Ligand binder design. Structure first.
Ligand code: HEM
Ligand code: HEM
Ligand SMILES: C[C@H](CCC(=O)O)[C@H]1CC[C@H]2[C@@H]3[C@H](O)C[C@@H]4C[C@H](O)CC[C@]4(C)[C@H]3C[C@H](O)[C@]12C
Ligand SMILES: C[C@H](CCC(=O)O)[C@H]1CC[C@H]2[C@@H]3[C@H](O)C[C@@H]4C[C@H](O)CC[C@]4(C)[C@H]3C[C@H](O)[C@]12C
Ligand SMILES: C[C@H](CCC(=O)O)[C@H]1CC[C@H]2[C@@H]3[C@H](O)C[C@@H]4C[C@H](O)CC[C@]4(C)[C@H]3C[C@H](O)[C@]12C
Ligand SMILES: C[C@H](CCC(=O)O)[C@H]1CC[C@H]2[C@@H]3[C@H](O)C[C@@H]4C[C@H](O)CC[C@]4(C)[C@H]3C[C@H](O)[C@]12C
Ligand SMILES: C[C@H](CCC(=O)O)[C@H]1CC[C@H]2[C@@H]3[C@H](O)C[C@@H]4C[C@H](O)CC[C@]4(C)[C@H]3C[C@H](O)[C@]12C
Ligand code: FES
Ligand code: FES
Ligand SMILES: [Cl-]
Lengths: 359, 359
């Protein structure tokens, strides 16, 4: 018995039922690593209470919550079995789930990993493409936790901090696309537009030099290479409400514009968040989707299945943890470089934490 | 002997001497592909006159003009010699240059192509990454030339409309970066930040769905992957014009940003225009580069050589022309899809011109 290697699976998490929405949002609007608001401690609870009902309504439209915990566990369980065979010298592997905004929280998972007396811990982001708002907040949590608790790790840390072009991730995307194309009529299959859709960033975050848009773009091109460019594609970005500029084209405006220009068959691909999540206006709202079919004659909008829903995804995850171990790296080279216009002093602390680890 | 296969090398061109600046600009501000303004016929010749001295001054700072013609013709001469040997069956290949804004203008080269009575013509964009402002405007000039002159083509047209990840383009970038890294002190080499720098696009063009940022990003990933991620990198965007929002991070602000955060060694890479072109503020203005070395202590900012240049670039060009011929495609799949929010009626006209060619 006793676990020697721990794999901390990091992700923002998601409310498992609609009652969880308030506290998910509370911890989100309190995240300094995500966004800076004046008097943040006092605004958060309020914004969180004002938006709980719209976000419960959105989660109701998709089954009443997020499956991310159950899917992450099961991928975790499957990654372990494969690792136990793959890397016998790192021996009993154990996965922990570290969500940023919901239980099991990142800090909770860190405590438990210490109590378990692990030999090595691996901060394994579940976001293939790095943004400071996602992977960087989760890594910043791991450092803000030793700095809060006043103590030093009792295990050796490393991080798998991005994997935007990992060959089995790319093969899972291409498989899910092929499968979904098979649901359009055969005579039409040729004309289906592949719209890769990733969550957008505000332009001020893009302009400070966030690495995310470039890495999402790289995953897109690998996928299309693997598909031998069989259909035409675009990368668009699911933006939102507020009147701050975000990186576009926006998913909803692109769908409408595509339909206005004669493209009636559209395949949406969630290229940057591997679990089920809130869907778009044309997927959800029937008067919109009605206006659209009547004005432009939309024939089919389909969304490809989430990866974190697969099997061979486990094989992707284990294969990464295993190359990471073979390679003896502490973090990717990219993590050694802070954004050109970074204004968050913890970023640099989190970087030295990882690059300075024993081993 | 007597030419059967014409290769029209398309590019914006550049003023060969400061004398040429005015007319370069005039034709640029009159390009309705590219940009629309009110009273365009009347506004352009003005804007052209107003900006001419600024732009003469910029070209003075880089040797007194653009060497694109000589470099393009020399690359063309070398693509032709290898094409003749690679594909005997497409016979006497001949290269034409078709610049958008300076002689030999694209319509001029189409006329001469028509008189040479070629069998097949290949619109071969010299921009590896597609934007509707660059490659699209050039393809659009070809269609608007036949619609101008109210006649149908006398040869079979096809297009190489983008090549952002061509394996030899990628190998030239990588070789050029390695050679420039060799110019930094051995002790510092691993600290050098690679800043890929591509010309920016205005946000309203990004938000209508231009393919360019995603393709430039794909080229960047392929290069760093060939270099095995030896240094850290970012993709930033240069040479923004006017006060509208353009896609950032800005190259200038990123260089300043990086130095105020301790990165003293910076290798800039022209990732998206293969010829010498106007350089950035920190490379040109000394009172700025002075403030910067005094306040942040910059050690070395260097810029990799243009693909220009190299002879394995001619090999890249020949190989692409030769794969195109072997493949029998008329255009890429991506070209059959207009931007989601395209508002240019000619775009669709240009697509079906290419997709509809005999053979
Ligand atoms: C600084 C950049 C970002 C900001 C400011 C931001 C903002 C927000 C906010 C405010 C919410 C809570 C829901 C709401 O009030 O509407 C949210 C939820 C969410 N964000 Fe972001 N976000 C950012 C980046 C990202 C990125 C890069 C990703 C994906 C890789 C992402 C994925 C999500 C997901 C999955 C949710 C849960 C709700 C849903 O399923 O759509 N976000 N975000
Ligand atoms: C719609 C998007 C674009 C607009 C509106 C635009 C605007 C301009 C303008 C106005 C000029 C003349 C110089 C001046 O007056 O300052 C110029 C020059 C130039 N543009 Fe663009 N540009 C765009 C996109 C691009 C792209 C995608 C490239 C890609 C490689 C590019 C490459 C150049 C080059 C090489 C010059 C010559 C001056 C120099 O060397 O920088 N441009 N552009
Ligand atoms: C005003 C400022 C804009 C950027 C900034 O100030 O940092 C923003 C950032 C978050 C904003 C608050 C949040 O945007 C939520 C509120 C939305 C209201 O309709 C506008 C005010 C509102 C209470 C905002 C007040 C003010 O506009 C804040 C605090
Ligand atoms: C969308 C979100 C909350 C919902 C809303 O009020 O629209 C609002 C409130 C807080 C806002 C963010 C915060 O004010 C902090 C950031 C400030 C930057 O100048 C723009 C992006 C930035 C990240 C904001 C963008 C956007 O308007 C946010 C994220
Ligand atoms: C470390 C080793 C060095 C020799 C090589 O490049 O093959 C190579 C082989 C596989 C390479 C890795 C893979 O290409 C995938 C990863 C890509 C990430 O963005 C950086 C680290 C990343 C993990 C790579 C780093 C490193 O250069 C690796 C591990
Ligand atoms: C905003 C407006 C056009 C509307 C649009 O296309 O978005 C812009 C586009 C280019 C502008 C013109 C050009 O920038 C050249 C001139 C610059 C001067 O500072 C003002 C007048 C001037 C003659 C501009 C007037 C006006 O601002 C124009 C015509
Ligand atoms: C850079 C130049 C400024 C010239 C001057 O002020 O002397 C201006 C003149 C015409 C402008 C363009 C045109 O107005 C058309 C476009 C309108 C969009 O809202 C911004 C980008 C857009 C493509 C403009 C970018 C830029 O401001 C241009 C190119
Ligand atoms: S905001 Fe990107 S490194 Fe800090
Ligand atoms: S502007 Fe992109 S296709 Fe017309
Ligand atoms: Cl043809």
């Amino acid at each position: 018995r006793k676990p020697k290697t721990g794999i901390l699976m990091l992700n923002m998490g998601g409310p498992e039922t609609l009652g969880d929405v308030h506290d998910f949002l509370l911890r989100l609007f309190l995240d300094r690593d995500l966004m800076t608001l004046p008097i943040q401690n006092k605004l958060a609870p309020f914004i969180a209470k004002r938006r709980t009902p719209k976000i419960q309504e959105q989660y109701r439209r998709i089954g009443g919550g997020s499956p991310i915990k159950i899917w992450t566990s099961k991928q975790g369980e499957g990654m372990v079995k494969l690792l136990d065979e793959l890397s016998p010298n790192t021996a009993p592997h154990k996965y922990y789930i570290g969500f940023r905004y919901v239980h099991p929280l990142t800090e909770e998972a860190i405590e438990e990993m210490e109590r378990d007396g692990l030999e090595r811990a691996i901060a394994f982001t579940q976001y293939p493409q790095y943004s400071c708002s996602t992977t960087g907040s989760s890594l910043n949590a791991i450092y803000r936790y030793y700095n809060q608790v006043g103590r030093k790790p009792t295990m050796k840390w490393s991080t798998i901090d991005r994997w935007p072009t990992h060959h089995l991730l790319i093969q899972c995307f291409a498989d899910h696309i092929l499968k979904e194309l098979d649901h359009f009529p055969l005579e039409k299959r040729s004309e289906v537009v592949i719209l890769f859709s990733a969550h957008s960033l505000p332009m001020s975050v893009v302009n400070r030099g966030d690495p995310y848009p470039q890495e999402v773009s790289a995953t897109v091109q690998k996928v299309m290479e693997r598909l031998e460019y069989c259909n035409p594609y675009r990368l668009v970005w699911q933006s939102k409400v507020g009147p701050m500029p975000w990186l576009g084209p926006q998913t909803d405006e692109s769908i409408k514009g595509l339909c206005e220009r004669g493209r009636k068959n559209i395949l949406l691909v969630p290229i940057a968040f591997t679990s089920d999540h809130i869907q778009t206006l044309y997927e959800l709202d029937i008067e919109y989707s009605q206006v659209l079919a009547k004005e432009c004659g939309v024939e089919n909008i389909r969304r490809a299945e989430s990866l974190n829903g697969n099997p061979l995804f486990s094989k992707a995850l284990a294969d990464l943890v295993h190359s990471h171990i073979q390679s003896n790296e502490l973090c990717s080279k990219q993590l050694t470089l802070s954004c050109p216009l970074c204004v968050n002093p913890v970023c640099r602390e989190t970087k030295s934490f990882f690059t300075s680890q024993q081993l």
